[PDB]
Amino acid sequence: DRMLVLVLGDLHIPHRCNSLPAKFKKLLVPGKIQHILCTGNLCTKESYDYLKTLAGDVHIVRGDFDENLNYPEQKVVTVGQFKIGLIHGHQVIPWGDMASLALLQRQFDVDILISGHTHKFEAFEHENKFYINPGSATGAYNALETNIIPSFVLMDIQASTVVTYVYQLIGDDVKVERIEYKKP
Amino acid sequence: XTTIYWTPLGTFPRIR
Numbered sequence: 149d150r151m152l153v154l155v156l157g158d159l160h161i162p163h164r165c166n167s168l169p170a171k172f173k174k175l176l177v178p179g180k181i182q183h184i185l186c187t188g189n190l191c192t193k194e195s196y197d198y199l200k201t202l203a204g205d206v207h208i209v210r211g212d213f214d215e216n217l218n219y220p221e222q223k224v225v226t227v228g229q230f231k232i233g234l235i236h237g238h239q240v241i242p243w244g245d246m247a248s249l250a251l252l253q254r255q256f257d258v259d260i261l262i263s264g265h266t267h268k269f270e271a272f273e274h275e276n277k278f279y280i281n282p283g284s285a286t287g288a289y290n291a292l293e294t295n296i297i298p299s300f301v302l303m304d305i306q307a308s309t310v311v312t313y314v315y316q317l318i319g320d321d322v323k324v325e326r327i328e329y330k331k332p
Numbered sequence: 333x334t335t336i337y338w339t340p341l342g343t344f345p346r347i348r
Binding site for chain 2: 152175176177180302304313314315316318321322323324325326
């Protein structure tokens with residue numbers, strides 16, 4: 149038995165982008181995925197409504213451009229044997245700072261910490277804990293990057309192991325990378 | 333080269 153968890157964010161619809169890539173939408177079939185963890189910056193209810201069609205359980209934290217000011221700034225969600233922390237990440241300066249993310253890991257008391265904002269995918273183990281940034285699922289521009297690849301993450305959780313899949317749109321084709329993490 | 337991965341959402345070439 150497994151849990152599938154979709155991890156995505158920084159869509160920036162409607163200001164920076166118009167929609168998810170068509171090839172991504174074709175992959176996200178309703179009913180398949182159990183949980184959605186969204187780093188924020190949807191930035192409107194239209195994208196929230198779309199996420200609700202995909203899974204029964206949708207968790208979203210507040211980004212710096214979200215129009216829904218009621219989203220929580222951070223969240224901790226338990227899926228199977230894993231506690232997962234979620235924050236958008238504009239609060240961390242310098243952006244993506246490893247020492248700050250590791251402090252948040254300890255303070256949230258989580259096995260996996262998910263953050264966004266940078267629009268650059270990351271998935272790595274650091275001091276026996278796992279860190280994910282799904283990137284921007286629409287490939288939305290930012291101020292500090294010259295190339296943003298549309299990206300999202302799927303976690304496949306099985307007992308004390310998670311297999312993290314990253315999906316990227318490169319050219320017009322979907323390509324993937326796979327990273328395994330086991331709790332210590 | 334021709335490396336591909338199975339995933340729960342389908343089978344795809346490797347990014348790198």
